[PDB]
Design a protein around this ligand. Structure first.
Ligand code: CLA
Ligand code: CLA
Ligand code: CLA
Ligand code: CLA
Ligand SMILES: CC(C)=CCC/C(C)=C/CC/C(C)=C/CC/C(C)=C/CC/C(C)=C\CC/C(C)=C/CC/C(C)=C/CC/C(C)=C/CC/C(C)=C/CC1=CC(=O)C(C)=C(C)C1=O
Ligand SMILES: CCCCCCCCCCCCCCCCCC(=O)OC[C@H](CO[C@@H]1O[C@H](CO)[C@H](O)[C@H](O)[C@H]1O)OC(=O)CCCCCCCCCCCCCCCCC
Ligand SMILES: CCCCCCCCCCCCCCCC(=O)OC[C@H](COP(=O)(O)OC[C@@H](O)CO)OC(=O)CCCCCCCCCCCCCCC
Ligand SMILES: CCCCCCCCCCCCCCCC(=O)OC[C@H](COP(=O)(O)OC[C@@H](O)CO)OC(=O)CCCCCCCCCCCCCCC
Ligand SMILES: CC1=C(/C=C/C(C)=C/C=C/C(C)=C/C=C/C=C(C)/C=C/C=C(C)/C=C/C2=C(C)CCCC2(C)C)C(C)(C)CCC1
Ligand SMILES: CC1=C(/C=C/C(C)=C/C=C/C(C)=C/C=C/C=C(C)/C=C/C=C(C)/C=C/C2=C(C)CCCC2(C)C)C(C)(C)CCC1
Ligand SMILES: CC1=C(/C=C/C(C)=C/C=C/C(C)=C/C=C/C=C(C)/C=C/C=C(C)/C=C/C2=C(C)CCCC2(C)C)C(C)(C)CCC1
Ligand SMILES: CCCCCCCCCCCCCCCCCC(=O)O
Ligand SMILES: CCCCCCCCCCCCCCCCCC(=O)O
Ligand code: OEX
Ligand SMILES: [Cl-]
Ligand SMILES: [Cl-]
Lengths: 38, 153, 51, 82, 341, 47, 38, 334, 36, 33, 37, 34, 30, 50, 65, 33
């Protein structure tokens, strides 16, 4: 049985996943665009 | 046990210079810490699983202390594992049995992995796995985590 | 009375700090070491050790 | 040594900086001012207005006393204000 | 190069504000803690959790605003925005005190991130990690006071509320209920803090008054060059001065500066240990011998017994409003009071 | 709590073993100068 | 008590006079660098 | 040389293990008197009627105190600001009952500590140093003056000076908060900034120098042996320390000038403590901390409490309980 | 670059900060939180 | 005063054990070549 | 029995002795009151 | 030759923009009557 | 016993002061 | 020589003597457990669990 | 160095000092397992804390009957 | 048993003071060249 608190836990887990994933995707994209010249 | 450990300590102190502690290739003292971790994890998992499956269950052992919600009729009883969601309820003793069974099995498997598979070079260098002090650091971390948990419970 | 007493205690104290500052500096400047210790004639280096 | 960003003094003594910010700074300040003067802050954060701390004849504080019913308790207090 | 290595390059670029891998944790968490404090102190009330006004919008000033702890009935709930208490309602979350746990948690993780920043920068520039090591004292204080103490008490309600006056109330509560001043761990903390201030002042002044003359200016600051190899002040003269004034003096600069690290750090750690004790009401409240003597002999009085009377007054007069969930009603006739006051 | 301090101390010793007795006497000022390297502490990124 | 009072007055006067006459005895010249300060 | 010339040379000699100097000629006897009387009183003095109501308070170890509770008790409120030397008493028994040791001790101590500051100046002059270490010392000394002399002068009695003991100090602090709301006074807030920041900067400076020590030793030796007393070269790399701290915050928030750095280290705590001393010395004349009691009111006129009102409840508890037998009238006016 | 002198910028900004703080103290004596 | 009896030995050992540790180390340092 | 090559001499200089004795004695003075209670 | 938008720009503005907004809000609060 | 203990510790500290001042290891310039 | 706070670093590259030291610590801990149990048995009064 | 019977038996277990797998090896798998472990810890903490409330899971002494 | 209270500290010091004297002498002998 999916209790309201279990639905809320899923919401929090997915929100954290989105936040972290967007942060890392943006960082990876920017690092690829603006590289260090060796 | 204390006396026996004292005698063994004397023996190892005097006969410190054992061939087992030397690298076969260079003759320098060396410990293969990754494989040591695998071995000790396998042993720990075996002991955890045995504690859960035999002692706490009463299959071969006394069980554990259990009581009613108002602490009026506590006694040592065998406890069966609780595999459902209530097994993660801290107040359900069956969860303790189930945890030690499952975590012990996981320890056995992961210990086999850490015995058989060498660390990635990236991690070996990052965590300085050639230096025993890295083990001291991470072990201290695990220990203070456990101490906080037991204080809380 | 409170306003006047507090204000002028503050002023009197900071002016004591001023006396100490400017008197010490005047002595040091008259003697010639208000800008620091001369490296080649450090007075303590010519004194006997305390022990 | 500097890391290549334009100097702050150079930026803040430049005409273009102030062309931009003589617009942006007042706009944000006015946005905050209006956020308060239109009363939207009260609604957003749930903060009582001066006339909404008590019922007319009430002197007891609306304290939350149940963990899992706290939302409903607050809503009941708000209704009792009416 | 692999994407991990490219990302490492970008994170460790030399720029006005260093980012680093630790930055990914530090900057969002520190920003959220600071922004939450400013937001709560500006707009958020404490009416439903404490019966208090606590924001500029309600009329408080910089000294009286706070982000107050959640209600005692919340227990030690994390009070997540999506949690079962607020249930995703932002306004109700704010009214229930979710901002306090929000600030405390994002701030704790921000402290972790900042210490990681100390480690990372030290490693990159090739210095030893002692600044990170010294930062352990602020972290120990924060953990002990804002997490362990409330976790040992009934709920987050009794943790310090994030505000000036709220912190003052925390001090006075600790005096009244814990007799915190009598605790030897707080005493060692006091020694560490005051001795650290003493060392700071005395060392600064000694350096500035044993400078060598390395220029013609009457303002002596321009006579130092960061790349110079020579000491800028006379250790020999400073040692002679303090030996003759105070009896002892430093003679080893490395020991001097390590001692400056050691004193305040150790003091703060000791205070943290004391607070861990107070989390369980494990107080240094009384001296049993003095209590036995005073109970039997009504002419025996010491500053210790006087302070106990003060504590009893604090408890009786502040509990009804400071602990509203208890519903204390103390009839006037039961309040402890001296003559005429 | 005390063991948290122990973790910090021994982890720092592990990661900074090479400077436990002090920093390089030859430490290049350019490695700490701002803007000299594109990447902090990587001489391969000299500008 | 009178003897104690007189003794204390004499002692204090002794030390204070030492202070005053000592600082009058050419104190500014007692430094390591420049004596003739007038 | 004549006898006086020889004596002056000895007094001002820079070769004495401990410098004497003309300030020292006053400092030594006064500090010895204060110390001897304090030790004897702390161990053996009988109870003292601090509040002048014939209710003696026991301060000494032999009369039932321990190290934490013991104290030399301030002189009786019946004496007020009157000068109470031994010879003003009919007997030592009366002197002790009325708390004369406190006056003897604090007066000799304040005079001796003033002379200690002067002695710092004087020896700096003899050694050819710059003169302002004594200025640094003026901060704690001002604090001592505030709690032992200024507050008693303002309040009209040495019985309100800080007791010479640990628990006595706590009593002084609590009553002070009850009567002046010192926590809400900006000068004490500046004092807290001064001492918290002093400790912070102490740790920061120590840690930065220790982190930038130059390698001169092996891992089996203390790094402290890498510095030799009196060596010409600097023992740490300030350039590296600046690189680290400037990247920790940002370049222009870090000192690259050691002289500026050490001046800041001196100035922060010293100024903070000056201001806190002034806080005590001005609350001595009853200019108290901020009072926001009932500042927030609703539309009808109901009082909306704030944390300041909670503070006020605590202060009321302290006020009603302190010196429980001494007040006969409704207002505590001093 | 340096079209508007930095001393002018600093003076004007300081005046603005002073005005804001002064208004806040005026509020201390008026409206909410004034005790009246 | 009715103090904890064990306080005397507690204090004595608290002082003596660490102090003697330090004294041992110092004297054996002094005696080294 | 070949000697162990990992042995090292240990030291405590006089200043360290004085500092340690001060720490110990002051801690004793502080905690003795609580030990006696 | 300097870029306009950088990490420093982002940090500066994350602090500056809300600061002006909040200062406007508090200024407005000064004129609230009970 | 408690008074004796307190006074003993104090007297030890004062003796320590004496030795640390007058029997210190002398600073010696290189 | 080694400062007092580093004396036990002589074990870092000496696995046998590290094992010896760990054995000594284990022996001390086990001995403490036994001693504590015996003290508690000498002092415990089992006559009223209620 | 002294050879012993037990030492000879245990020899193989301490013969691969310094041996590593190339590059990243199993690091991604380790990362996945770490994420799962962290999520499990979060779930257990929320259960103990009453932030996650599940049917049939009563976090109280009354779980004893 | 109602024993002399001071017996504990008497015995402890009787053992510790001479023993530490001997230990100091022995260790500083061992450390000599
Ligand atoms: C069906 C299988 C099963 C079941 C029923 C259980 C059942 C249980 N497990 Mg086990 N587990 C299993 C399989 C299983 N396990 C497997 C396969 C593994 C992998 C090896 C584990 C690994 C594991 C761990 C690592 C832990 C458990 C724990 C538990 C217990 C949770 C209740 C509790 O007291 O939490 C109490 C603990 C928590 C709620 C975790 C708190 C996390 C903290 C807050 C993180 C931060 C700590 C950090 C130091 C910061 C502190 C700062 C602070 C001072 C302010 C319970 C007996 C926990 C336990 O032993 O509890 C006593 C525990 O810690 N399990
Ligand atoms: C490094 C940055 C960082 C960190 C460490 C935290 C940490 C925290 N935040 Mg803060 N937060 C951040 C950034 C961060 N936040 C940002 C940028 C914002 C603005 C958007 C917020 C806004 C915010 C709010 C509004 C709240 C928090 C809260 C919290 C707490 C609970 C978080 C939680 O349970 O997540 C759990 C989530 C995870 C552990 C992520 C797991 C990710 C794995 C990979 C997911 C795996 C399964 C998943 C289903 C993937 C599916 C894939 C596929 C099926 C599609 C915690 C202290 C709460 C709080 O403070 O309560 C008082 C709260 O209410 N945060
Ligand atoms: C598993 C735990 C563990 C282990 C094995 C080590 C091992 C080590 N530590 Mg680490 N350490 C730990 C925990 C641990 N530490 C913790 C928890 C802390 C924080 C308190 C520290 C803080 C720390 C510092 C600051 C330093 C070390 C150092 C060292 C090394 C030398 C130690 C020595 O010679 O002491 C010799 C100690 C003595 C001769 C006397 C100590 C007396 C203590 C203070 C009081 C008595 C304690 C009592 C007898 C035992 C009760 C313990 C019980 C309650 C747990 C050694 C490798 C040193 C190092 O790295 O050297 C290079 C070093 O400088 N450690
Ligand atoms: C101030 C905190 C702090 C600091 C500065 C360090 C610093 C260090 N640690 Mg230690 N560590 C800590 C806490 C800390 N640790 C804690 C609490 C644990 C768990 C017991 C560990 C476990 C640990 C291990 C096992 C190891 C280290 C290692 C290290 C070193 C390498 C850096 C590293 O691994 O980062 C660790 C990274 C972090 C601490 C940041 C984690 C951020 C998390 C993922 C955010 C999670 C948010 C969460 C989901 C929000 C929801 C919770 C909410 C609902 C309550 C370095 C000396 C390594 C080492 O010594 O190598 C030589 C090593 O092997 N650490
Ligand atoms: C999840 C997601 C999105 C993550 C992505 C995050 C990300 C990567 C972001 C990119 C960067 C980004 C956009 C920026 C974030 C912007 C931003 C503002 C957010 C964080 C803001 C915030 C919460 C924090 C700001 C607060 C902050 C830490 C400031 C502290 C400033 C402060 C008061 C410093 C004290 C300065 C001071 C002068 C101290 C003196 C100390 C002292 C005396 C030192 C002694 C000393 C000094 C020397 O000098 C040397 C030499 C030596 C010897 C020495 O003794
Ligand atoms: C670019 C900007 C990025 C930098 C900002 C970075 C974020 C950090 C923000 C820190 C600022 C915190 C101060 C907020 C105070 C505030 O807004 O007061 C806002 C309040 C508003 O004033 C109140 O307004 C109320 C409205 O209902 C009522 O009228 C009250 O009577 C009235 O007092 O102002 C005051 O309290 C008076 C002036 C306070 C001046 C600042 C106090 C700090 C000075 C002392 C220093 C203490 C240390 C500060 C921290 C270090
Ligand atoms: C060289 C300095 C030596 C003196 C020591 C300084 C005493 C302490 C001063 C501290 C405050 C500094 C006042 C500036 C002292 C000073 O010299 O100012 C001048 C300085 C540089 O100014 P310019 O860019 O004009 O530089 C001209 C250059 O060409 C060379 O000077 O300006 C700044 O740094 C202010 C920018 C505020 C930056 C705000 C950024 C916010 C970012 C938030 C993220 C922060 C990082 C968080 C880390 C976790
Ligand atoms: C309201 C009054 C509070 C401010 C009083 C002064 C605070 C600074 C003094 C600290 C003494 C520390 C121990 C001596 C430490 C020491 O020896 O310092 C010495 C240090 C450098 O000495 P120099 O000889 O290079 O310069 C001083 C003179 O010789 C002039 O060249 O003096 C200063 O830098 C003086 C700065 C005055 C700066 C202008 C006046 C103060 C304005 C700022 C006050 C702000 C209050 C907020
Ligand atoms: C040889 C031998 C033997 C014998 C043995 C024995 C008899 C043993 C004993 C042992 C023991 C009998 C042990 C003991 C131990 C103990 C310990 C190890 C202790 C510890 C302690 C501590 C560590 C403490 C600490 C503290 C204090 C003091 C105070 C408070 C705080 C604390 C808790 C921290 C036998 C015949 C069997 C067999 C053969 C061989
Ligand atoms: C919480 C939260 C969040 C976040 C938020 C934030 C991030 C915010 C921020 C905010 C901010 C960021 C704000 C700010 C403000 C500021 C202010 C309000 C300021 C003030 C200032 C002042 C008042 C000052 C003054 C002065 C003086 C007095 C003197 C000197 C100068 C000066 C100017 C400094 C989110 C979204 C996630 C959602 C959930 C919840
Ligand atoms: C620069 C700077 C700054 C700022 C400053 C400021 C902001 C200032 C202002 C100032 C001012 C703003 C001033 C003013 C002045 C004025 C005056 C001085 C006036 C006078 C007047 C008079 C004398 C009058 C008289 C009269 C009478 C008596 C009667 C009727 C008629 C008349 C009105 C004519 C800062 C710190 C940020 C940074 C650094 C730089
Ligand atoms: C470790 C990184 C953590 C990041 C967490 C980011 C949190 C963002 C949360 C914003 C959405 C909140 C969900 C609101 C709806 C939930 C209502 C409910 O079902 O209970
Ligand atoms: C300096 C500026 C002082 C602030 C004065 C602001 C007054 C606001 C007007 C009040 C009556 C409307
Ligand atoms: O002597 Mn001590 O304390 Ca000053 O206020 Mn009134 O007099 Mn008593 O009463 Mn509150
Ligand atoms: Cl009182
Ligand atoms: Cl009266």
């Amino acid at each position: 049985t999916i209790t309201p608190s279990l639905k809320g836990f899923f919401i929090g887990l997915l929100s954290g996943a989105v936040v972290l994933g967007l942060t890392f995707a943006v960082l990876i994209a920017i690092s690829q665009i603006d590289k260090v010249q060796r | 046990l204390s006396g026996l450990l004292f005698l063994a300590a004397c023996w190892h102190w005097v006969y410190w210079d054992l061939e087992l502690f030397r690298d076969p290739r260079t003759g320098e003292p060396a410990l293969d810490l990754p494989k040591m971790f695998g071995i000790h994890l396998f042993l720990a998992g075996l002991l955890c699983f045995g504690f859960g499956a035999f002692h706490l269950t009463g299959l071969f052992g006394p069980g554990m202390w259990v009581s009613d919600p108002y602490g009026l009729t506590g006694s040592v009883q065998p406890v069966a594992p609780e595999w459902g969601p209530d097994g993660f309820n801290p107040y359900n003793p069956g969860g303790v049995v189930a945890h030690h069974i499952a975590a012990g099995i996981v320890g056995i498997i992961a210990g086999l992995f850490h015995i058989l598979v060498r660390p990635p070079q990236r991690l070996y260098k990052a965590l300085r796995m050639g230096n025993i002090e890295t083990v001291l650091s991470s072990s201290i971390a695990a220990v203070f985590f456990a101490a906080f948990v037991v204080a809380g419970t | 009375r409170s306003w006047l007493a507090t204000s002028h205690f503050v002023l009197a104290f900071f002016f004591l700090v001023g006396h100490l500052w400017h008197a010490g500096r005047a002595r040091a400047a008259a003697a010639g070491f208000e800008k620091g210790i001369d490296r080649e004639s450090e007075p303590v280096l010519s004194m006997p050790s305390l022990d | 040594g500097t890391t290549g960003e334009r100097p702050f003094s150079d930026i803040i003594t430049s005409v273009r900086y102030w062309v931009i910010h003589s617009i942006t700074i007042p706009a944000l300040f006015i946005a905050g001012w209006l956020f308060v003067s239109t009363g939207l802050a009260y609604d957003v954060f749930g903060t009582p207005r001066p006339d909404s701390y008590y019922a007319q004849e009430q002197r007891s504080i609306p304290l939350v006393t149940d963990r899992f019913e706290a939302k409903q308790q607050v809503e009941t207090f708000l209704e009792q204000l009416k | 190069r692999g994407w991990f290595d490219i990302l490492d390059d970008w994170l460790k670029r030399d720029r006005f504000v260093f980012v680093g891998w630790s930055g990914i944790l530090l900057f969002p968490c520190a920003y959220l803690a600071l922004g939450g404090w400013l937001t709560g102190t500006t707009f958020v009330t404490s009416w439903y959790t404490h019966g208090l006004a606590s924001s500029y919008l309600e009329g408080c000033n910089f000294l009286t605003v706070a982000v107050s702890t959640p209600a005692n009935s919340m227990g030690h709930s994390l009070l997540l925005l999506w949690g079962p208490e607020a249930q995703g309602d932002f306004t109700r979350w704010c009214q229930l005190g979710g901002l306090w746990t929000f600030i405390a948690l994002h701030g704790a993780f921000g402290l972790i991130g900042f210490m990681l920043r100390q480690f990372e920068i030290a490693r990159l520039v090739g210095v030893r990690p002692y600044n990170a090591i010294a930062f352990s004292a602020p972290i120990a204080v924060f953990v002990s006071v804002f997490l362990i103490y409330p976790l040992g008490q009934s709920s987050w309600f009794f943790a310090p509320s994030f505000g000036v006056a709220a912190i003052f109330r925390f001090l006075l509560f600790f005096q009244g209920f814990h007799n915190w001043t009598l605790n030897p761990f707080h005493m060692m903390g006091v020694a560490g803090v005051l001795g650290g201030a003493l060392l700071c002042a005395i060392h600064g002044a000694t350096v500035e008054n044993t400078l060598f003359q390395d220029g013609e200016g009457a303002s002596t600051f321009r006579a130092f060059n960061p790349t110079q190899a020579e000491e800028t002040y006379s250790m020999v003269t400073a040692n002679r001065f303090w030996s003759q004034i105070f009896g002892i003096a430093f003679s080893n600069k490395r020991w001097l500066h390590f001692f400056m690290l050691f004193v305040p750090v150790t003091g703060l750690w000791m205070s943290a240990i004391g607070v861990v004790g107070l989390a369980l009401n494990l107080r240094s409240y009384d001296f049993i011998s003095q209590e036995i003597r005073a109970a039997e002999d009504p002419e025996f009085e010491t500053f210790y017994t006087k302070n106990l009377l003060l504590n009893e007054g604090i408890r009786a007069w502040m509990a009804p409003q400071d602990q509203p969930h208890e519903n204390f009603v103390f009839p006037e006739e039961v309040l402890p009071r001296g003559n005429a006051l | 709590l005390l063991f948290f301090f122990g973790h910090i101390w021994h982890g720092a010793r592990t990661l900074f073993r090479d400077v436990f007795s002090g920093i390089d006497p030859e430490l290049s000022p350019e490695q700490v100068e701002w803007g000299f390297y594109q990447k902090v502490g990587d001489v391969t990124t000299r500008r | 008590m009178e003897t104690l009072k007189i003794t204390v007055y004499i002692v204090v006067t002794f030390f204070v006079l030492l202070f005053v006459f000592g600082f009058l005895s050419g104190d500014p010249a007692r430094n390591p660098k420049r004596k003739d300060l007038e | 040389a004549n006898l006086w010339e020889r004596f002056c040379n000895w007094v001002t000699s820079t070769d004495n293990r401990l410098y004497v100097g003309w300030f020292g000629v006053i400092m030594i006897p006064t500090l010895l008197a204060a110390t001897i009387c304090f030790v004897i009183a702390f161990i053996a003095a009988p109870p003292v009627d601090i509040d002048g109501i014939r209710e003696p308070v026991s301060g000494s170890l032999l009369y039932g105190n321990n190290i934490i509770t013991g104290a030399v008790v301030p002189s009786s409120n019946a004496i007020g600001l009157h000068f109470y030397p031994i010879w003003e008493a009919a007997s030592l028994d009366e002197w002790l009952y009325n708390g004369g040791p406190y006056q003897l001790i604090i007066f000799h101590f304040l005079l001796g500590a003033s002379c200690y500051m002067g002695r710092q100046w004087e020896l700096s002059y003899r050694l050819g140093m710059r003169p302002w270490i004594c200025v640094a010392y003026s901060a704690p000394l001002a604090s001592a003056f505030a709690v032992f002399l200024i507050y008693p002068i303002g309040q009209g009695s040495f019985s309100d000076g800080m007791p010479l003991g640990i628990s006595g100090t706590f009593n002084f602090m609590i009553v002070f908060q009850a009567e002046h709301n010192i926590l809400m006074h900006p000068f004490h807030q500046l004092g807290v900034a001064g001492v918290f920041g002093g400790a912070l900067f102490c740790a920061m400076h120590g840690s930065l120098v220790t982190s930038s020590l130059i390698r001169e030793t092996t891992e089996t030796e203390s790094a402290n042996y890498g510095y030799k007393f009196g060596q010409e070269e600097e023992t740490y790399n300030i350039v590296a320390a600046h690189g680290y701290f400037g990247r920790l915050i940002f370049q222009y928030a870090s000192f690259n000038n050691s002289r500026s750095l050490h001046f800041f280290l001196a100035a922060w705590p010293v100024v903070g403590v000056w201001f806190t001393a002034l806080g005590i010395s001005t609350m001595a004349f009853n200019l108290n901390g901020f009072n926001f009691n009932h500042s927030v009111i609703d539309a009808k006129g109901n009082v909306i409490n704030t944390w300041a009102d909670i503070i006020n409840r605590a202060n009321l508890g302290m006020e009603v309980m302190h010196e429980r037998n001494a007040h006969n009238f409704p207002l505590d006016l001093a | 670059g340096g079209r508007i002198p930095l001393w002018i910028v600093a003076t004007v900004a300081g005046m603005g900060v002073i005005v804001i703080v002064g208004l806040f103290f005026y509020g201390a004596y008026a409206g909410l939180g004034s005790s009246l | 005063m009715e103090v904890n009896q064990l306080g005397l030995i507690a204090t004595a050992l608290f002082v003596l054990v660490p102090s003697v540790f330090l004294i041992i180390l110092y004297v054996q340092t002094e005696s080294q070549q | 029995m070949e000697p162990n090559p990992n042995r090292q001499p240990v030291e405590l200089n006089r200043t360290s002795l004085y500092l340690g004795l001060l720490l110990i004695l002051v801690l004793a003075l502080l905690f003795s009151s609580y030990f006696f209670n | 030759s300097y870029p306009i938008f950088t990490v420093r720009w982002v940090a500066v503005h994350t602090l500056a923009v809300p600061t002006i907004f909040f200062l406007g809000a508090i200024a407005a609060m000064q004129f609230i009557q009970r | 016993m408690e008074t004796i203990t307190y006074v003993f510790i104090f007297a030890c500290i004062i003796a320590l002061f004496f030795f640390a001042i007058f029997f210190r290891e002398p600073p010696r310039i290189t | 020589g080694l400062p007092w706070y580093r004396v036990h670093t002589v074990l870092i590259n000496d696995p046998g003597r590290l094992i010896a030291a760990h054995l000594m610590h284990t022996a001390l801990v086990a001995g403490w457990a036994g001693s504590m149990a015996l003290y508690e048995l000498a002092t415990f009064d089992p006559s009223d669990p209620v | 160095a002294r050879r012993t019977w037990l030492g000879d038996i245990l020899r193989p277990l301490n013969s691969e000092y310094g041996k590593v797998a190339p590059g990243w090896g199993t690091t991604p798998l380790m990362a996945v397992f770490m994420g799962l472990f962290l999520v499990c810890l979060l779930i257990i903490l929320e259960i103990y804390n009453s932030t996650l409330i599940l049917d049939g899971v009563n976090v109280s002494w009354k779980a004893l009957g």
